[PDB]
Design a protein around this nucleic acid. Structure first.
Length: 98
DNA sequence: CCCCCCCCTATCGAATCCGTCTAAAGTTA
């Protein structure tokens, strides 16, 4: 997909349609994104992909990342609660605590 | 003429010596 403007238009239309559908049909919507590397000077940071304008589309945004052998859940953007950090784990039973 | 975005890579390079112990066996008028 070489044309960035076309991708931006498609993503904006998709976000509008998804929020309209979620509000109209009383639905909870979850989307999954991928990280990417942003380089400034000589250090690199992991940021969500798909540009910057995509950040306004999601009502709530969460970020998972590694710290030693621990998994952390961070509430990045939300209009109802405050930023927090949560430790979670993956077990044979599934998504769990600790 | 109009309005918005992308991405990690790759190993290197040796130094520095110390600290002594344990005696035994008589001979030939």
């Amino acid at each position: 997909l070489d044309d960035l403007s076309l991708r931006t238009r498609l993503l904006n239309g998709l976000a509008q349609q998804m929020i309209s559908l979620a509000n109209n049909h009383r639905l909870a919507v979850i989307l999954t994104n991928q990280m990417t590397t942003k380089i400034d000077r000589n250090q690199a940071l992991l940021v969500p992909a798909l540009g910057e304008s995509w950040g306004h589309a999601a009502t709530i945004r969460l970020i998972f990342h590694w710290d030693r052998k621990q998994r952390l859940a961070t509430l990045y953007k939300s209009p109802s609660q405050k930023e927090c950090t949560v430790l979670f784990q993956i077990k044979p039973q599934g998504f769990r605590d600790t």
